[PDB]
Amino acid sequence: LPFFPPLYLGGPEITTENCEREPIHIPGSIQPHGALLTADGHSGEVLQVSLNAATFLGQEPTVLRGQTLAALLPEQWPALQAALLQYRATLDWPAAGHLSLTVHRVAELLILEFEPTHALRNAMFALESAPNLRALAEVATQTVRELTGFDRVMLYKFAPDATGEMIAEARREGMQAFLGHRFPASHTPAQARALYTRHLLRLTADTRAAAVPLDPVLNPQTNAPTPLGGAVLRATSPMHMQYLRNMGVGSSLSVSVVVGGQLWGLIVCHHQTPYVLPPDLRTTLEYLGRKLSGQVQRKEA
């Protein structure tokens, strides 16, 4: 069923009667482990600023808004113009350390995300070399756990009725096994599955952290919601954050397994405490997800 309007445009709050209608791609807010700016794709005027931006950028949102990326990021703007796809850079000026910058374009808007910042050969080989699907799933979960340190890494496979089952698991010594457990379709509702066919990694770094609004919440170009499906800092559905908290999960991350353009499954990662998977490790997981997807497709053929 069609998306409801977002809450800030008067849409209903989601219940178990209408899981699938939540417009999860346009929450108008981000997770607090990074900052997000949006900017006009021609002028570089900063249009929207997350309310926490001073934490990462050292200037208040009121000061940042209306400035150009030419003024604020003199080195990256030309490279940004040229490049914009993701553009990625490391910024060295924080006293806090270094910042990872990730940019993507949606229509006429640039979306800029800032957060603090042979294993590959081996992981790729492991995946390519698995001779059957069970071995592939086992090696994928083990490899992701090894790389990330997550407490629990599972492979969740969708059935034709969109229920799912955990079909492989790597987990911390002594943790109760979730392998073999099955869950209803509504736990990963259809609009989420659809989004996950287009934007292949998403996460919640702290399942108890309040979302941070974008200000203004609407894109001034369009007077409409800002597309955040491609922003890993996007705020997570409240329904899902509650699901995670009730499971004792402090941090969650999944990677899509896409076969024939359909969502075959998810690599599902949990940590019991909050945990910000480092930026370079996300990129690695993306690579691994694509490889896993290719191998699942290869094997089913």
Ligand SMILES: *C/C=C1/C(=C/c2[nH]c(/C=C3[NH+]=C(/C=C4\NC(=O)C(C=C)=C4C)C(C)=C\3CCC(=O)O)c(CCC(=O)O)c2C)NC(=O)[C@H]1C
């Ligand atoms: C009425 C709405 C409901 C709801 C919505 C919902 N769920 C997601 C996203 C996910 N659900 C996942 C399901 C599982 N994770 C597990 O660990 C297990 C079992 C042990 C299951 C079945 C997963 C993996 C995701 C993806 C995100 C992630 O990796 O953390 C969304 C979309 C969240 C977002 O991207 O903003 C939504 C709207 N879930 C329900 O249970 C009902 C109440």
